[PDB]
């Protein structure tokens, strides 16, 4: 009696007003699903699942984004002859808000034009007391978080060792506080890491 | 006076007899390079760099692979009017041998056919006392290591949380001991992780 899947289109990071979709589905005939949200505004939803060949689905849309809506979501599914026998919970998915506070500074190192093979360490910071820092490589699968190294010259940074330079890329950085893990700051200005090639 | 780059074609993992190449280069006019190997058979090499437009280069070939040749390499470069004024050392690159001992067992979980969005945790093990475990996603950029969880039912495994299932893929697993970090066992039989898609 497996659990459903919880996706997020466009993606987990959402700017204010910006409204997002959380497609919960399974290859089963789940009659209807529940979308629970853990955290601040602990709330629950319900949707009768559509049934495009081989797959049931409930596309919940989290309306105009706000701080009270970002948090951990988990999805459930139940079938006709027992809609109160809930399925196993789907892997928790975090939906966050972006642009709440000042954007950080994202420096590269060695520099932003290393040659193929050279290891790179993107490292961002701020004068603000951010407790975390998130690295988003333009589109690339997912993000990477990191605990800040508080106070040094007023700044608080975190270094992200990307390892030897694979391909180029555009990375952005976000800062957040422990307080509310789903509330993030603006996006650091985009950094183009350019990997000079070899024969 | 930057350092050169050290690549490895085909790649860092080398089976016995199999002979590999370590292309060290820079966009500078390095007259000649040095290839030092740290570890077991501490040895050093020298090569006058060729000069294909915009780039000098020394392609050292580590002959018939054996345990005494695998280890940490670092590359240096010096220019004509001072070939004894060495450059900064290039990022250490590890060259390893594969197939020294029994291959491990690479199980998937939930299973090897999760749906898009579902998180996966490849987890391999062995009856042998491996202290480490390395995950190689067929071609995918690089590897990921992990400390084993010794003795449980005779076995010693390590779980690799791949996170939510991006794309499918073929993963292999290797086991090694602390003793010689460059000596690895055979490759676990290939695992095809198939990510069922969504609308």
Assess whether B103 and B90 both reside in one domain: no
> CB contact, 8 Å: A42 with chain B?
no
What is the number of domains present in chain A? 2
- Alpha carbons A198 and A179: distance in angstroms, whole number: 46
Write out the H or E segment, with its range, that includes residue B176: strand B169-176
Assess whether A187 and A115 both reside in one domain: yes
| Interface contact flag, A198 B25, Cβ < 8 Å | yes
- Alpha carbons B139 and A198: distance in angstroms, whole number: 18
- Residue matched to tokens 């954007």: A103
Assess whether B104 and B134 both reside in one domain: yes
Do the beta carbons of residue A146 and residue A167 sit within 8 Å?
no
Do the beta carbons of residue B76 and residue B86 sit within 8 Å?
yes
Method used for this model?
A: X-ray
Q: Would you tell me how many other CB atoms lie within 10 Å of the CB of residue A104?
A: 27
Assess whether B85 and B104 both reside in one domain: no
Using alpha carbons, select from A155, A170, A154, A185 the residue that is nearest to residue A108.
Answer: A170
Read off the CATH number of the domain in which B116 is found. Answer: 2.60.40.10
- Alpha carbons A104 and B49: distance in angstroms, whole number: 42
> CB contact, 8 Å: A6 with chain B?
yes
Say which of A116, A119, A142 has its CB closest to residue B7: A116
Gyration radius of chain A's alpha carbons: 20
Q: State the resolution, in angstroms.
A: 3.0
Using alpha carbons, select from B88, B87, B125 the residue that is nearest to residue B108.
Answer: B125
Assess whether A130 and A199 both reside in one domain: yes
> Domain boundary residue among B98, B126, B149?
B98
Assess whether A89 and A108 both reside in one domain: no
Say which of A3, A6, A117 has its CB closest to residue B5: A117
Distance of CA A103 to the CA centre of its chain: 17
> CB contact, 8 Å: A85 with chain B?
no
- Residue matched to tokens 């034009």: A113
> Domain boundary residue among B98, B133, B158?
B98
Assess whether B109 and B84 both reside in one domain: no
| Interface contact flag, A196 B57, Cβ < 8 Å | no
Assess whether A79 and A110 both reside in one domain: no
> Domain boundary residue among B78, B98, B118?
B98
Assess whether A26 and A111 both reside in one domain: no
């Amino acid at each position: 009696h497996r659990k459903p899947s919880l996706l997020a289109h466009p993606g987990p990071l959402v700017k204010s007003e910006e409204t997002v979709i959380l497609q919960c589905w399974s290859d089963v005939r789940f009659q209807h699903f529940l979308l629970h949200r853990e955290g601040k505004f602990k709330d629950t939803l319900h949707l009768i699942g559509e049934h495009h060949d081989g797959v049931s689905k409930a596309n919940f849309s989290i309306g105009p984004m706000m701080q009270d809506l970002a948090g951990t979501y988990r999805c459930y599914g139940s079938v006709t002859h027992s809609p109160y026998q809930l399925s196993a919970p789907s892997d928790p998915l975090d939906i966050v808000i972006t642009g709440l506070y000042e954007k950080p500074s994202l420096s590269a190192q060695p520099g932003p034009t290393v040659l193929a093979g050279e290891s790179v360490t993107l490292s961002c910071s701020s004068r603000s007391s951010y407790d975390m820092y998130h690295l988003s490589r333009e589109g690339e699968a997912h993000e990477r978080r990191f605990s800040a190294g508080p106070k040094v010259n007023g700044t608080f940074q975190a270094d992200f060792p990307l390892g030897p330079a694979t391909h180029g890329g555009t990375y952005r950085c976000f800062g957040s506080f422990r307080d509310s893990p789903y509330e993030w700051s603006n996006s650091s200005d985009p950094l183009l890491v350019s990997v000079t090639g070899n024969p």
